[PDB]
Amino acid sequence: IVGGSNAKEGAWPWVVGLYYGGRLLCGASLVSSDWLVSAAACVYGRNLEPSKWTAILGLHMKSNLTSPQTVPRLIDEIVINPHYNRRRKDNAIAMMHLEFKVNYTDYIQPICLPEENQVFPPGRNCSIAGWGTVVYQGTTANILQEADVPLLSNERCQQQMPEYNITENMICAGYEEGGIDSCQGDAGGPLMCQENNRWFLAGVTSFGYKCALPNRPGVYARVSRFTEWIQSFLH
């Protein structure tokens, strides 16, 4: 996918991995003590059997699931946003309920949701996370990657990718010359923006056209307008 870098231990405590059938299929974020926020597209068609989903909290390396800092958990309830379409790829955000609960620790922390009428200005650098690949396809990296990419306004996003509706329900991040992206390969985590002195769940990894290609913005699911829906299930 190009653009990844090394991630320190505990750098992203709210990034968790989702395993279905023994393989890392998608990613999620830790918001509360019993709920996760993940992409609805990658969990579609597998919500009838939540027992087959393995939620790994505090994961740092693909083949090092032995440290005590990582506490595996199961998923019992899976809910998908009713506004999802699967044809326009609109509102690809779904929530997964943990088995019982998770104890807060240094390497496992929640992430604050955006408040009402809180929009991150475009052009502000934000971090991305996920267990993506170095090349466009294949050769999955065993170490969590991190990169900084400024937000792209939807006005130019709808023109740079004249294939979707985009509308106001998506947030685009990318570069004019490309190089840094997280849309394809594997989500493995959401889009995080930090203002004041704390990160926020600004976006969730979504579909895309190409990785490390110029004039190919990376689409991310907008969470500012979905704060109420998430908070309805958080408590």
């Binding site: 023994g22 393989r23 890392l24 299929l25 083949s63 396809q137 294949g138 050769t139 999955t140």
Partner: protein, 232 residues
């Protein structure tokens, strides 16, 4: 009425199919056949895959990129089944002895031999570098998998009359489309954690309503044990 004769097979990319220590590959300058590892020196592979020079790769994940976790042991002796029939592709099983003992780790290990014959409808897993692509020629270099329950004997016999015996069984209920681009040869067939057979042949790359044929190794367990005892 021009045509192109192309299709695709269901996606089975997985997470590069890791945590599969019983999967091995046979190399003679390129990947041609697969196989399974049964002990520290013997492997199970299809009889038709016999070649003068074969290199056995242990725990391989990419056929073109070396990640440093692959064991390369050259083949020392290859024994084919004495009752192999090339015309009918019956008794399509052979054993290859590694020159040096394998190193057992998280990526290389052995799978226990089956003790009971497979049953109809039993869930099975097939591992191999299959040809999965959206369109065109985009053959991947990563290990893949695909579930395949065992079908009934009568249906298997009726599917290919004159070419099916008691040592063969169908792949599964999967139609498989019209890909017609085979990419699996000698791939392990594991049912309930036991190697019930290997990939032998089929009518194309699992053409619609015509599944492939796998060589059952339950009847060959005694032959494998005798071969191991005679060439320990």
């Amino acid at each position: 009425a021009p045509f192109d004769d192309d299709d695709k097979i269901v996606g089975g990319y997985n997470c590069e199919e890791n945590s599969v220590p019983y999967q091995v590959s046979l190399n003679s300058g390129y990947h041609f056949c697969g196989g399974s590892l049964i002990n520290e020196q013997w492997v199970v592979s299809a009889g038709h895959c016999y070649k003068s020079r074969i290199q056995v790769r242990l725990g391989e994940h990419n056929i073109e990129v070396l990640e440093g976790n692959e064991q390369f042991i050259n083949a020392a002796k290859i024994i084919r089944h004495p009752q192999y029939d090339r015309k009918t592709l019956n008794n399509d099983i052979m054993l290859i002895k590694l020159s040096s003992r394998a190193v057992i780790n998280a990526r290389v290990s052995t799978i226990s031999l089956p003790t009971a014959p497979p049953a109809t409808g039993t869930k099975c897993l097939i591992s191999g570098w299959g040809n999965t692509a959206s369109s065109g020629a985009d053959y991947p270099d990563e290990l893949q998998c695909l579930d395949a329950p065992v079908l009934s004997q009568a249906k298997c016999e009726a599917s290919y009359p004159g070419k099916i015996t008691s040592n063969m069984f169908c792949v599964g209920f999967l139609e498989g489309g019209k890909d017609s681009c085979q990419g699996d040869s000698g791939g392990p067939v594991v049912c309930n954690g036991q190697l019930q057979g290997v990939v032998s042949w089929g009518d194309g790359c699992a053409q619609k309503n015509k599944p492939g044929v796998y060589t059952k190794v339950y009847n060959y367990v005694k032959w494998i044990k005798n071969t191991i005892a005679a060439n320990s």
